Amino acid sequence: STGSATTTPIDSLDDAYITPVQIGTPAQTLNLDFDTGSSDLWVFSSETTASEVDGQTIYTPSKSTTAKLLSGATWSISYGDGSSSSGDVYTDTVSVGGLTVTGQAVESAKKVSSSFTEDSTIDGLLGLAFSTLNTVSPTQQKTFFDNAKASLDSPVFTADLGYHAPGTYNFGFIDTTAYTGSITYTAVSTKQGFWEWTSTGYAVGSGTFKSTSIDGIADTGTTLLYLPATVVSAYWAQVSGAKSSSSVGGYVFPCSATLPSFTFGVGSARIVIPGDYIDFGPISTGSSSCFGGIQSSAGIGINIFGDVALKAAFVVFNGATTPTLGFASK
């Protein structure tokens, strides 16, 4: 089997991407944020505290003939940005782009934090990291990908995120028309439950490439590129007037600037992030100070290759017995 679904930016800044997902019988279609940095499939639901729902589409398990309460199971998750959600658990049929899993754990939110409530476009998350991070207790549950894997033509999924445009998540096959050149594969550590890999270095603009190992995670659910302070300082030093603002919470730059590209290494290969991808626009409406798309990971504890980096590439998440990650230009 295979599946293929279009993923669409939620706003003009590519702050996140949503992908339609069919849950239950008859299908209830919710727009979920596919997150390779977490391992819970959770949704706004008929059980979500009413004051915490503001425009989202909800899953109503009582209207699904295939829904079953997973008795005694609860879940609770926090994310790197301090947002959180929690609730109980159903199993139901879940389909993505024509690929169907029966008996998938669908985590129904009873509570969500304000950031989720305030984002009307995101109806929940679909985690695609390793199932060892799944938060369901007392019986940990598998991700959609792990459940699907044995049925897939090949045990892989791919992320092809667009810049200010739709893109694609494919399951079970590699679309050889979707990238240029060759895919370079690199080793993954699953020790922390993430798609964790080591970049071979970086360049700023047309500058020379610095060979240096940068350990980080491929995370479709994080908007920006978070790298060590040394690397980030070297980037922003090439933008006149750029500075780190403690009050704003990161590097800002004059909106009149033309940003340089940023290159990262994947083995001997190179992925180039165009300067435009690094512009996240005015810090507040009407401001001439713009927010940068490359920020320090110093306060986080891990480097994160988020959407800013990933959308410059065609990315293969290879879930073979020994997982690997592949990157191609496109």
Swiss-Prot record:
EC number: 3.4.23.22
Nucleotide-binding among keywords: no
Disulphide bonds in the chain: 255-290
Molecular function terms from GO: aspartic-type endopeptidase activity
Top-rank EC class of the record's enzyme: hydrolase
Keywords: Aspartyl protease, Disulfide bond, Hydrolase, Protease, Signal, Zymogen
GO annotation terms (biological process): proteolysis
Domain called Peptidase A1: residue spans: 17-328
Catalytic activity: Hydrolysis of proteins with specificity similar to that of pepsin A, prefers hydrophobic residues at P1 and P1', but does not cleave 14-Ala-|-Leu-15 in the B chain of insulin or Z-Glu-Tyr. Clots milk
Superkingdom per UniProt: Eukaryota
Active site: 35, 199
Protein family (similarity comment): Belongs to the peptidase A1 family.
Protein name as catalogued: Endothiapepsin
Source species of the chain: Cryphonectria parasitica (Chestnut blight fungus)
Lineage: Eukaryota, Fungi, Dikarya, Ascomycota, Pezizomycotina
Primary gene name: EAPA
